[PDB]
């Protein structure tokens, strides 16, 4: 039983094939991410050239950051904040946009800032601040096998695959998002952009729906 090159050559072969499989799906998502990103661009030209208006699909995903501290919050908003796992200032969570989630977002509007996040924002978050809930323990991802052993049931094998299930809300988004620990962000690097935070974004403040300006805000936090 030499057992220093027999199984080691076996484990390396099993590692190479996993790296091999991870490679096509990253390439596969690339043409899938490119094609769709160019379809809406091109479908807008066709509408204008045909004398019509292309009404894009309503956004399916929002990123929510808790803006207020933990003091002096009425019962109903405090419960809804807990159900989204935002239990301290500058915390992040992805929420699937649905009727049962919109009404939660209205109750918490004075306390959160949210919008529609792009690929660059979400890709950077998981790479820098992505943690998995591993047996009720907050574990840095830092390897594909960590996601593999915990989200391999649903076909998720990598950190890049996990981002895919987030941005395109798939059949296993609920488990995938739940696996992702709530993001602990810092304060924005360049500031909040306003003198007073706790007014609505429409009213010169910070809280509410900032439809794409969340990307600028989260990147300064990230």
């Amino acid at each position: 039983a030499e057992q220093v090159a027999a199984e080691r050559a076996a484990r390396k072969a099993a590692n190479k094939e996993k790296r091999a499989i991870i490679l096509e799906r990253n390439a596969a998502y690339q043409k899938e991410y490119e094609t769709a990103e160019r379809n809406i661009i091109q479908a807008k030209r066709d509408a204008k050239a045909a004398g019509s208006y292309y009404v894009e699909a309503q956004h399916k995903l929002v990123f929510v950051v808790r803006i207020k501290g933990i003091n002096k919050i009425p019962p109903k908003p405090r419960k809804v904040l807990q159900l989204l796992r935002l239990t301290r200032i500058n915390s992040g969570t992805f929420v699937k946009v649905t009727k049962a989630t919109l009404e939660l977002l209205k109750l918490i509007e004075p306390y959160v800032a949210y919008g529609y996040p792009s690929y660059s924002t979400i890709r950077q978050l998981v790479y820098k601040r992505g943690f998995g809930k591993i047996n009720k323990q907050r574990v840095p991802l830092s390897d594909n096998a960590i996601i593999e052993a915990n989200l391999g049931k649903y076909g998720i094998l990598s950190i890049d695959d996990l981002i895919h299930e987030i941005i395109t809300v798939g059949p296993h988004f609920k488990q995938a998002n739940n696996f992702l620990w709530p993001f602990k962000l810092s304060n924005p690097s360049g500031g909040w952009g306003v003198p007073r935070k706790f007014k609505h974004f429409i009213q010169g403040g910070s809280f509410g729906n900032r439809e794409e300006f969340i990307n600028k805000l989260v990147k300064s936090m990230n």
Binding site: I40, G51, Y53, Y54, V55, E56, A57, Q58, T98, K99
Partner: protein, 53 residues
């Protein structure tokens, strides 16, 4: 709902299509094309003040 829920599974097992017996909430809308044939936009402006009394 049980009757339809029991009925849909019974018909589905003849072909196995994963009938998805669960209920879904109201989803965000998907894309569409709105055309302006005879529906050309008309511009509205804020109205001035009047007392009406």
């Amino acid at each position: 709902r049980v009757k339809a829920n029991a009925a849909k599974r019974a018909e589905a097992k003849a072909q196995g299509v994963a009938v998805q017996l669960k209920r879904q909430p109201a989803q965000p809308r998907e894309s569409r094309i709105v055309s302006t044939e005879g529906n050309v936009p008309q511009t509205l402006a804020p109205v001035p003040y009047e007392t009406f009394i």
